[PDB]
Amino acid sequence: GEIYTETLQQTYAWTAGTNIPIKIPRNNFIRKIRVQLIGSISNSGTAAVTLPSAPFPYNLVQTFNLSYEGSKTLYSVSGTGLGILMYYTTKGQNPAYPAPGTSVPASGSVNLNVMWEFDLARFPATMVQNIILSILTGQAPSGVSINASFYITITYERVTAQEILSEGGLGADGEMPLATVLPKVIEIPTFNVPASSAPIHVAYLQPGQIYKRQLVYVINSTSGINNTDPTEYELKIVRGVPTDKIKVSWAALQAENQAEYQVAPYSGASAIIDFRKYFNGDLDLTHAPSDSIEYDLALQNQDNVYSLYVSYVLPYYDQLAALPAQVAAIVQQYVARQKRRIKR
Amino acid sequence: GEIYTETLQQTYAWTAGTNIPIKIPRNNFIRKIRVQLIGSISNSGTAAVTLPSAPFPYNLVQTFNLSYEGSKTLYSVSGTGLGILMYYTTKGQNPAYPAPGTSVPASGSVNLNVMWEFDLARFPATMVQNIILSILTGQAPSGVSINASFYITITYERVTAQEILSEGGLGADGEMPLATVLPKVIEIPTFNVPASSAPIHVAYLQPGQIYKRQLVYVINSTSGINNTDPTEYELKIVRGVPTDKIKVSWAALQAENQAEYQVAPYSGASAIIDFRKYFNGDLDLTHAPSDSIEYDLALQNQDNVYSLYVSYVLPYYDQLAALPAQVAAIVQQYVARQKRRIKR
Amino acid sequence: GEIYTETLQQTYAWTAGTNIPIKIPRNNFIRKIRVQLIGSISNSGTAAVTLPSAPFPYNLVQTFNLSYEGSKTLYSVSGTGLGILMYYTTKGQNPAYPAPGTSVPASGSVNLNVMWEFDLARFPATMVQNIILSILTGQAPSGVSINASFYITITYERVTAQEILSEGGLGADGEMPLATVLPKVIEIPTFNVPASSAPIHVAYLQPGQIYKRQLVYVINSTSGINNTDPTEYELKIVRGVPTDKIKVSWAALQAENQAEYQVAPYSGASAIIDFRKYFNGDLDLTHAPSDSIEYDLALQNQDNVYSLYVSYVLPYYDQLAALPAQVAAIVQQYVARQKRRIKR
Amino acid sequence: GEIYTETLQQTYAWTAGTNIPIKIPRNNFIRKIRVQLIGSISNSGTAAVTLPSAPFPYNLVQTFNLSYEGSKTLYSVSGTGLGILMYYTTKGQNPAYPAPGTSVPASGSVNLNVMWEFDLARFPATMVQNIILSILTGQAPSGVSINASFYITITYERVTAQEILSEGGLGADGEMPLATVLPKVIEIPTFNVPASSAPIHVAYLQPGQIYKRQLVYVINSTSGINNTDPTEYELKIVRGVPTDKIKVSWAALQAENQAEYQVAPYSGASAIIDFRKYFNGDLDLTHAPSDSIEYDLALQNQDNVYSLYVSYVLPYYDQLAALPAQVAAIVQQYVARQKRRIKR
């Protein structure tokens, strides 16, 4: 239909340790929602205070949560999480001022402007209820004050009653178009995975969805996200014949990110693993038994691993699979196009 | 066919405030013409002279004008205009030395190397007359002297009589192939759009072509192109039901450019709005009544807004429209490839 | 099939002027082999030693040589050669620390990490014998000591007996699949091509393979690889009526490297010419009579030109051509996917 | 088939803190690999140097790593680990000279002869690639010099194509026989498990394999491996009904080792627990959810607990499980036999 974008008149002040829930107008379907922390970080203290380094500025928003009907979750990431995912998928050019470790002049200030982007493909925002993007801000850097607000830029696509029939009408219960592709960008953080030289089990990818790529990063208590502990990552298919779809050294996985994302590594402790490259197309676990695919980690020390998945579910996956080869062909091209929209 | 590239032996010295007309050899069809200001900027003075900031080096070529038969304008942009479009569409990787503000060693010199590129898709250069690329050079920076020249590099495509037929033969009048897509990158500057917070009408896009993307940038009298007045951009469809295809904050538009072109904003006063992301496919105005789409701006101070469009024309727009779904479809794929070859 | 990647446990200590032969496990077919020099460059001297400039760090590995059966070569390049090919095909994002000219703190050190990537398309490693990637390390920079090892990351594709029947079964003599595409990245060096302003004959591309792209770079005895002598590149069809597919000036050749690769020139003395844009598809000479296409160079001074080609051979190229229009369609589509896989 | 053993022609000199990679010949299947450090430990100093106490001589080989294809790890243990496990599974009868604390006569020497044993059941070595047992030697004891080499003794079993079919032919992907039993003897070291009287959580056994017996030993910073901190061992099943398969005091655990292995305790800080004695048959966690069985330790002080497991995997565990009670009976009888070959 007719994509068209706008910022909402209503903003939200960045306050420390707060949950500022945001209502997303349900005009047409929503393709993507950008959020920007814009203002300045003021140093009113006598000596020039150096801003904390990575994940800053991203961590100013401790967490994000875009879900609808209060029950259904489309997003769940931390600002440091969605922030690094943004950093890669945009050739590391995603707006993030000021850079880590920058000094706020003594009794003067620097400029704040960070961004996130939730890709909802073509989310039927009008057929569902209560899309609330809850931003739980984190903590203000030490010595300086975050003087910003949030600006929601929502991109609607004017899907018509007409176009909807042209992609397979509605679903099973007719709650969304048959060809709906809900992004399920979740982030499951792990604690105290032990220091090892051989990749030890870290966590399972749970079924009920199609995984596109996974952003994994470790958090050392001393260096934060600027350590070099993860040395050997590993995706083992546990169900069926134990097969290693991935057994690459950290250096080499980040090497693939050099070629993949054409940008230097976000830090010594982060990387991305694209499933379409180790499988044929996307890694589907929609109907796969649980604990069939896990990822491992060889950490120099024992730390905390955060794993952000950029996956999506097809709310009518059975009706699309159970479709006539005639219709399935056309419906497939719609869902297929949609799955690629949700990059970041 | 067989694309193939060469430089033209004849070069032209960049002289200040001059018009240097270039004849573009008409061998085969022309896919693209790159022009390069290559030489040095010499400071013969006692003190190290810092070169002007953006748009320099770009404005060393005040304006460009690539057209055929002397009357059909394929291009009409300024070096500052086409130059900035170049800065975005190539991840800011475009050759542009020296950078804004670089110092020319006192009684020593720096290196000059700037580039532009006119994308003509697959322009029937063998079937028209006189492709003359007129470069109206600007002014030599203060304190330094430009000792460069232009190198016209042309990309021909061996479209054969055979193939032209494989795409719908010639036009109605048979002056170019039916499936021709003449790029019409024009640039229309506005003066004194007054200072305001609610976007005031800036200018209408006048019909007679399909718009692919628009590059808007403001020029303050004090800061040149490095101000931050543009705060609110807005695409209002005036004719028909009144609507806003765009109502994004400037911060937010330079935002879509980070994710889009993966490069930092050329300055606080620039951006690009891709029409393909706000309509279904390209923004066509071949037959729309004039004044049906205007774009607005909320400027901090009152300045000059330059609007560069990367739009293209289909000289047989009608036969393409009154052709059979049988043929329309085959011709459609050619106009289709051609339309995207014209990026920059 | 089932792509899956792993690093081999066994690393190899980098020693100056040595040949370190590596056995590459022939588990499944091999798609790409990554090699990384990872460790540090230690300075034990009193004064901080600044590392040699380009080609360092790439030249720490003098040459590479991947072949199977001790007589059939898939690769034959220098670290400086394959290294620069790497610098381009990944937007200059290929891992190469530290950068040229970096200072190793006096009695402290810097970080080493350089990589190469051998694209074997989908090489039938299980059907051949002894895939040995021989690495002939170069020389330790003067004043610092290289303390790294090599890490072999191989990407196998679980091609099955079944799937092989599905692409045309076996070859003529049945030693590899009929649709095999063996990479032939060779590098032919020419010495003392005289100084001239008119591109003088440098060397012919010999037949017996399809050229995908050629990386040419000159080496001044003074500036090493950092000179600006190559001024005029030129691809001449010598057989028949003399024709020029390329007659592009050096500046402009690096220009297409700007748009093509979106990365700054590796040095003033290098470039890449892709045959796909100067012919229709790849420049095939499996059957053109020899000395039928040569490339020229107008060099400022008299130097050494190294020409690295990313070419590939079809071991049963004839049965692919003598296959029924029925089968040729399917086999061709497999050979084609394989041909583009060998990018870097 | 026809079991048969020979020592490999190539030996390897024991040097301090080195990694000596060994290629393991793949003639027939591999039943067991013995490694012996044989030579003498010379004292060149004026006074008789008494050799370090346990784990020496075992720690002369810091670590072991027997894996195939450079990725799949069959063994990952330390010389102190496999060494102590050897000390138990053989009635303390495994060759280990000199004993700990023995005096190397002043300007004279003693005899060195240690031995380790990797039980690979009947590993399909002809069907896999690169079985490389990497011995990363530790440190030469203080005051004496280790003058030995390693002797690789391999036990091949001539499994014939016929015989292989007699147990279910090959697996699903047919890479190893269906009835294969890959030893997975890993060792996971834990750091600083705090001092306590009631057994505190030490670590979980992560899934994907069948555990045979576990060798746990604590390492005090003061007494090394010769302390008596572990006082209360405990195997707690966390998932499902919470249960204690073991809740025996250390004294009593070394007690079950007296009768079990008929040998005095290796040290006050070591023990072994056989799962077949606490479950019915082996403790299998092939598909059990992660974190379902952990082991606890009441330590006098807070120390490092090393947990060596002798577990094994069934690469086709499902086809063995999804096999008819008809075929399952014969295949089970083979795997059952293999599983016990891997004792040590």
| DSSP states along A325-340 | HHHHHHHHHHHHHHHH
CA distance A52 to A98: 10
Do C251 and B91 count as a contact with CB atoms less than 8 A apart?
A: no
For residue C102, the tally of other CB atoms under 10 A from its CB is 17
Q: Whose CA is closest to A1, among B281, B202, D219?
A: B281
Distance in Å, alpha carbon of C95 to nearest chain A alpha carbon: 6
- Residue D96 φ/ψ, nearest 5 degrees: -150, 75
The angle subtended at Cα D75 by Cα D73 and Cα D79, nearest 5°, is 145
Which chain D residues have a beta carbon less than 8 Å from that of C6?
A: 69-71
Mutate to test the interface with B, among A5, A31, A111, A153 (most CBs of B within 10 A): A5
**Separation in Å, CA B231 to CA A199, B244, B251, B266, B303:** 50, 16, 7, 15, 13
The angle subtended at Cα D170 by Cα D165 and Cα D175, nearest 5°, is 145
**Nearest-by-Cβ selection for A241 from D188, D289, D315:** D315
Q: Whose CA is closest to C86, among C71, C102, C64?
A: C64
CA distance B147 to B110: 11
CA distance D186 to D169: 28
CA distance D320 to D339: 14
* Contact indicator for C223, C265 with CB cutoff of 8 Å: no
Q: Which amino acid is at C152?
A: I
Touching subunits of D (3+ CB pairs, under 8 Å) are A, C
Which chain B residues have a beta carbon less than 8 Å from that of A1?
A: 280
CB pairs under 8 A between A and D: 43
Beta-ladder partners of D6: D154
Q: Scanning every residue of chain A, which has its alpha carbon at the shortest distance from the alpha carbon of D286?
A: A238
B316 alpha carbon, distance to own chain's centre: 23
Touching subunits of C (3+ CB pairs, under 8 Å) are A, B, D
Distance in Å, alpha carbon of B1 to nearest chain C alpha carbon: 6
Q: Quote the radius of gyration of chain B (alpha carbons, Å).
A: 21
CA distance C317 to C339: 13
In A30-55, which positions are buried (b, 16+ CB within 10 angstroms) versus exposed (e)?
bbbbbbbbbbbbbbeeeeebbbbebb
Which chain B residues have a beta carbon less than 8 Å from that of C254?
A: 95
In D186-214, which positions are buried (b, 16+ CB within 10 angstroms) versus exposed (e)?
bbbbbeebeebeebbebbbbbbbbbbbbb
Q: Which amino acid is at B17?
A: G
Which chain D residues have a beta carbon less than 8 Å from that of C9?
A: 21, 65, 67, 70-71, 132, 134
D191 touches chain A (CB under 8 A): yes
Q: Which amino acid is at A166?
A: S
D265: preceding bond cis by omega (within 30 degrees): no
CA distance D112 to D40: 5
Q: Which residues contact C343 (CB under 8 A, 6 or more apart)?
A: C89, C119, C212, C310
* Contact indicator for B35, B151 with CB cutoff of 8 Å: yes
CA distance A258 to C91: 9
Q: Scanning every residue of chain C, which has its alpha carbon at the shortest distance from the alpha carbon of D129?
A: C25
A153 touches chain B (CB under 8 A): yes
Q: Which residues contact D166 (CB under 8 A, 6 or more apart)?
A: none
Which resolution in angstroms does this entry have? 4.5
Owner of token pair 């021909």? B156
CA distance A86 to A266: 10
- Token output for C251: 């500046």
Owner of token pair 């093509």? C260
Q: Which residues contact D316 (CB under 8 A, 6 or more apart)?
A: A241, D171, D172, D176, D178, D180
Q: Whose CA is closest to B225, among B41, B15, B48, B58?
A: B58
SS (H, E, C) D83-149: HHHHHHHCCCCCCEECCCCCEECCCCEEEEEEEEEEEEEEECCCCCCCEEEEEECCCCCCCEEEEEE
Reduce the DSSP state of residue C301 to 3 states and report it.
Answer: coil
D203 touches chain A (CB under 8 A): yes
Do B5 and C259 count as a contact with CB atoms less than 8 A apart?
A: no
**Nearest-by-Cβ selection for A247 from D71, D190, D203:** D71
Reduce the DSSP state of residue C77 to 3 states and report it.
Answer: strand
Reduce the DSSP state of residue C87 to 3 states and report it.
Answer: helix
* Contact indicator for A309, A211 with CB cutoff of 8 Å: yes
C98: preceding bond cis by omega (within 30 degrees): yes
Q: Whose CA is closest to A250, among A231, A267, A235, A234?
A: A231
CA distance C312 to A118: 42
Q: Which amino acid is at A323?
A: L
Q: Whose CA is closest to B263, among A59, C159, A95, C273?
A: A95
**Nearest-by-Cβ selection for A6 from B244, B256, B279:** B244
- Token output for A241: 């014949």
N-terminal to C-terminal alpha carbon distance within chain C: 21
| Segment (H or E) for B75 | strand B75-78
Do D129 and C10 count as a contact with CB atoms less than 8 A apart?
A: no
| Segment (H or E) for C325 | helix C325-341
**How, if at all, do strands D182-193 and D75-78 pair?**
parallel
* Contact indicator for C235, C243 with CB cutoff of 8 Å: no
DSSP B178-232: TT--EE-EEEEEEEEEPB-SSPEEEEEPPSSSEEEEEEEEEEBTTTBT------E
- Token output for D113: 């002869």
Q: Which residues contact A302 (CB under 8 A, 6 or more apart)?
A: A192, A193, A194, A195, D191
Experimental technique used?
A: cryo-EM
Do D69 and C25 count as a contact with CB atoms less than 8 A apart?
A: yes
Q: Which amino acid is at D144?
A: V
Mutate to test the interface with B, among C250, C258, C273 (most CBs of B within 10 A): C258
Q: Whose CA is closest to A89, among A32, A9, A153?
A: A32
CA atoms within 13 A on the CB side of D186: 21
Mutate to test the interface with B, among A31, A93, A97, A113 (most CBs of B within 10 A): A93
- Residue A84 φ/ψ, nearest 5 degrees: -75, -30
Q: Which amino acid is at A121?
A: A
Distance in Å, alpha carbon of A96 to nearest chain D alpha carbon: 38
Burial of C240 (0-12, 13-18, 19+ CB in 10 A): exposed
CA atoms within 13 A on the CB side of B257: 30
C3 touches chain A (CB under 8 A): yes
Q: Which residues contact C328 (CB under 8 A, 6 or more apart)?
A: C320, C321
**Nearest-by-Cβ selection for D290 from A194, A204, A241:** A204
Q: Which amino acid is at A61?
A: V
Q: Whose CA is closest to A50, among A87, A104, A131?
A: A104
- Residue C321 φ/ψ, nearest 5 degrees: -85, -30
| Segment (H or E) for B131 | strand B131-136
Mutate to test the interface with B, among A2, A3, A7, A154 (most CBs of B within 10 A): A7
* Contact indicator for C117, C125 with CB cutoff of 8 Å: no
Q: Do you know the residue count of chain D? A: 344
* Contact indicator for B168, B159 with CB cutoff of 8 Å: no
Q: Whose CA is closest to B277, among D90, A41, A32?
A: A32
Reduce the DSSP state of residue A231 to 3 states and report it.
Answer: coil
Q: Whose CA is closest to A218, among A248, A197, A190?
A: A190
For residue D326, the tally of other CB atoms under 10 A from its CB is 8
CA atoms within 13 A on the CB side of D6: 10
C92 touches chain B (CB under 8 A): no
* Contact indicator for B235, B334 with CB cutoff of 8 Å: no
- Token output for B126: 């063998």
For residue A142, the tally of other CB atoms under 10 A from its CB is 10
CA distance A11 to B255: 17
Reduce the DSSP state of residue B116 to 3 states and report it.
Answer: strand
| Segment (H or E) for D340 | helix D325-341
Number of alpha helices (DSSP H) and beta strands (DSSP E) in chain A: 5, 22
CA distance D181 to D335: 6
| Segment (H or E) for C212 | strand C210-219
**Nearest-by-Cβ selection for A95 from B258, B278, B280:** B258
- Token output for C159: 């091609």
B113 touches chain C (CB under 8 A): yes
Which chain C residues have a beta carbon less than 8 Å from that of D173?
A: 158
For residue B216, the tally of other CB atoms under 10 A from its CB is 24
Number of alpha helices (DSSP H) and beta strands (DSSP E) in chain B: 4, 24
* Contact indicator for A36, B252 with CB cutoff of 8 Å: yes
CA-CA-CA-CA torsion sign (D324, D330, D334, D339): positive
CA distance D249 to D228: 12
CA atoms within 13 A on the CB side of A146: 31
B contact residues 220-279, partner A, Cβ 8 Å cutoff:
243-249, 251-252, 254-256, 258-259, 262-264, 277-279
C5 touches chain A (CB under 8 A): yes
Helix-helix angle D250-261:D79-89, to 10 degrees: 60
Do A251 and C2 count as a contact with CB atoms less than 8 A apart?
A: no
A230: preceding bond cis by omega (within 30 degrees): no
Do B252 and A91 count as a contact with CB atoms less than 8 A apart?
A: no
* Contact indicator for B166, B177 with CB cutoff of 8 Å: no
* Contact indicator for B262, B91 with CB cutoff of 8 Å: yes
**Separation in Å, CA C204 to CA A323, C199, C243:** 57, 14, 14
DSSP 8-state secondary structure symbol assigned to residue C209:
S
**How, if at all, do strands C3-7 and A243-247 pair?**
parallel
CA distance C91 to C85: 10
A287 touches chain D (CB under 8 A): no
CA atoms within 13 A on the CB side of B268: 13
Burial of B324 (0-12, 13-18, 19+ CB in 10 A): exposed
Beta-ladder partners of B19: B136
DSSP 8-state secondary structure symbol assigned to residue D166:
T
CA distance C343 to C262: 16
A57: preceding bond cis by omega (within 30 degrees): yes
C247 alpha carbon, distance to own chain's centre: 24
